[PDB]
Structure 1
Amino acid sequence: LHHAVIPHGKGGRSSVSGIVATVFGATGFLGRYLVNHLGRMGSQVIVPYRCEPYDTMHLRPMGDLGQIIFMDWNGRDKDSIRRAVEHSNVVINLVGREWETKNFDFEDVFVKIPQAIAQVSKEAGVEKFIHISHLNADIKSSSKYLRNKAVGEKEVRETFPEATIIKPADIFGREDRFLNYFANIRSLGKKTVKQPVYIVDVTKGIINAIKDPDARGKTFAFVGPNRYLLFDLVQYVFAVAHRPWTTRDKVERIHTTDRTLPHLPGLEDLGVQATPLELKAIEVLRRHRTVQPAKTV
């Protein structure tokens, strides 16, 4: 282990954690809190960004001087991926779109780009790789999202055999598109059962998966502590928010139940206690204001 990557300090902002992290997709929602929790340890966070540099400004106070290296990359340029990962000791993937675009479909975002990142990270000597799938990923799933994400998970597993693949159920938080989706829909109630996971629990799970050497080659299912039906969940969202852009793929995924995978470990086997919805939903939905808790199963 090299002398510059030995940890030092008391784990604060000016400390050294020995984590040289390349977070693909740090400009989004999971990457926000992930770069926050990495940089507050004193980790060398490499942020490959695709967007305008203005849209990366919030990542800049998240660490000490020189501890966030921004650089350009393309999903169809393996040279830029190698230019981003050739010094990192961990590579986290967080590339995702809820909607397919003119230049990237779900096959590009969930299959081609994660396999490219994992292949280049294998042939660059990166120790640790973390992939973020979805809990309901299935080949025979109704939505194209979960089909291509199951395909990309299989490809990441077969091209990086030690890839820590993580299954969040439905991540809620401030900049989420789950509770902010329900508070701004003003779809319906069915027999769909969900257990949504909190974003800080997911971030602590990812960083404890970095820190646990036994999490290599594993597959985790980051689920919340309380399973809810869809209907009383949506009624609880409209009860907290003081209320009386979509596609059919999101309609299929909201009416897709969060499956139970007891053979996979979860948040507790990384040392993270799951934060329930009712302690954070007021914090999420206070912005939407111009409460009896939901029924669990």
Structure 2
Amino acid sequence: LARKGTGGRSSVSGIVATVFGATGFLGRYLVQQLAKMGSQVLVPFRGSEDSPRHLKLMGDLGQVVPMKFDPRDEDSIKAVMAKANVVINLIGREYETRNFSFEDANHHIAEKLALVAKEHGGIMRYIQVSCLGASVSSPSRMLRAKAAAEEAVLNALPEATIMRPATMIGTEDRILNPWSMFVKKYGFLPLIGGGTTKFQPVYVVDVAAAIVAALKDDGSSMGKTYELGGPDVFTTHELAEIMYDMIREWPRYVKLPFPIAKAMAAPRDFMVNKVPFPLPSPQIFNLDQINALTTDTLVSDNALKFQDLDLVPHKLKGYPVEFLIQYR
């Protein structure tokens, strides 16, 4: 955009972004890309002010302005998107919480940010982030919601990019860090469904590099739902094989039939019932993540891949997984 600089960390890029999901595992890499290529980031946080503290750095003195906002209350989303031209949406959950349901956290928000950005005429690029294979009739209610979110962000706001990152790996992720700390149940890894799932993980740095690459691009990458798949189409068991290469442990997997898992994840699905107590965020056994685990639709079809962003993803061996060394 109106870029006046050389690199970043003091440059300008005319991108005063509001990364709605910045205080999150994908958010810290995307905010660092947007604010290391020298552009403002209006990180909106939901609760504790300690959430975006790790984002006050990685941006030079107001290039990252953490702001407070209530997800269900507008006139605050409009205040966060007051001075903005890019609005990325990383607000998503893999687990239903007693207060915010799957739609009220994946679909009824993305549609709401879409509408309140449409109203705030001036949002040049609105990126919408949803999981890969999030198409309607997918088992996991998280993916059906995330599909409705795409359909409502494109309808209510055309020329709005839609990344489709598959399960993203990296430090502080929700895919590998639960498996480790469950290998700390004495090497016991419960790969569910027998590892027949075929899903294409991707180094979160490269998902961020794609989310920024659709901003730095021209008028293209508007309304075109990418699929940030990644290389080396894996299987859950095979991906676990690479963890045990980093964390020094001996592969001691077990297979779990899907009924056994869905029964093991039958608790923590009474979230709307147990009102006077919030449940502890089901990490590995998530009935909805399991419904997604069943069908191996998490593979990039002939839709737009990283190749349509002049970008090639990193592998999943070596550094893009070296966050596991802290578990040795």
Q: TM-score, normalised by structure 1?
A: 0.91
Q: Tell me if 1:247 matches 2:286.
A: yes
Give the one of 195, 198, 215 matched to 1:210: 215
- Matching residue of 1:17: 13
CA distance in 1, matches of 2:197, 2:300: 16
Residue 234 of structure 2: aligned partner? 228
In the TM superposition, residue 260 of structure 1 has moved relative to its aligned partner by: 3.6
Alignment of 1:27-176 (within 5 A): 27-125=23-121, 126-176=123-173
CA distance in 1, matches of 2:147, 2:310: 26
Q: Deviations for 1:70-90, whole angstroms, at most 9, x for unmatched residues?
A: 221111111111111122111
Cα drift, residue 131 of structure 1: 0.3
Which is bigger in relative contact order (C-alpha 8 A, separation at least 6)? Answer: 2
CA 1:178–1:7: 2 relative to 1, 3 Å: same
Q: Secondary structure at the match of 1:157?
A: helix
Answer 1 or 2: which has greater strand percent: 1
CA distance in 2, matches of 1:143, 1:82: 31
In structure 2, distance between residues paired with 1:238 and 1:100: 30
Which structure has more helix as a fraction of its residues? 1
Residue 42 of structure 2 aligns to a residue whose secondary structure is strand
Offset of 1:184 from its aligned partner?
A: 2.8
Q: Paired residue for 1:273, among 312, 317, 321?
A: 312
Contact residue 81 and residue 87 of structure 2 kept, 8 A: yes
> Match for 1:270: what amino acid?
L
Query: Percent same amino acid at aligned positions?
Result: 44
The answer as to whether partners of 2:169 and 2:321 remain within 8 angstroms in 1 is no
Counterpart in the other structure of 2:187: none
Q: Which residue of 2 aligns with 1:257?
A: 296
**Contact 1:183–1:238 (Cα < 8 Å) also in 2:** no
Q: 1:256 and 1:239, CA in 2 relative to 1: closer, same or farther beyond 3 A? A: farther
Query: Do the aligned residues in 1 keep the contact of 2:200 with 2:299 (CA within 8 Å)?
Result: no
In the TM superposition, residue 159 of structure 1 has moved relative to its aligned partner by 0.6
Q: Equivalent residue for 1:292?
A: none
User: Separation in 2 of the partners of 1:102 and 1:115?
Assistant: 21
Which residue does the alignment assign to 1:294?
Answer: none
Structure 2-normalised TM-score? 0.83
What amino acid sits opposite 2:114 in the alignment? A
Whether contact under 8 Å (1:169, 1:258) holds in the other structure is no
1:6 match: 2
Distance 1:30 1:249, change over 3 A: same
Taking the aligned partners of 1:87 and 1:38, their CA distance within structure 2 comes to 16
* Alignment RMSD (CA, Å): 1.6
Any conservation in 2 of the 1:95–1:109 contact (CA below 8 Å)? yes
Q: Supply the distance in 1 between the matched residues of 2:51 and 2:300 (Cα, whole angstroms).
A: 37
Provide structure 1 residue ranges, at least 5 long, that are not aligned to the other structure: 290-297
Deviation at 1:182, TM superposition (A): 2.1
How far residue 261 of structure 1 moved from its aligned partner, in angstroms, is: 4.0
Amino acid at match of 1:185: F
1:240, 1:281 within 8 Å by CA — same for their partners in 2? no
Residues 282 and 200 (structure 1 numbering): CA distance in 2 closer, same or farther, change over 3 Å? Answer: closer
Q: Distance in 1 between matches of 2:47 and 2:310?
A: 34
- Residue 275 of structure 1 deviates from its aligned partner by 0.5
Structure 2 spans left out of the alignment, 5+ residues: 184-189, 251-281
User: Could you list the per-position Cα deviations for residues 112-166 of structure 1 after superposition, in whole angstroms to 9, with x for gaps in the alignment?
Assistant: 1100100010110111100001112122111111111111111111111111001
- 1:190/1:255 contact within 8 Å kept: no
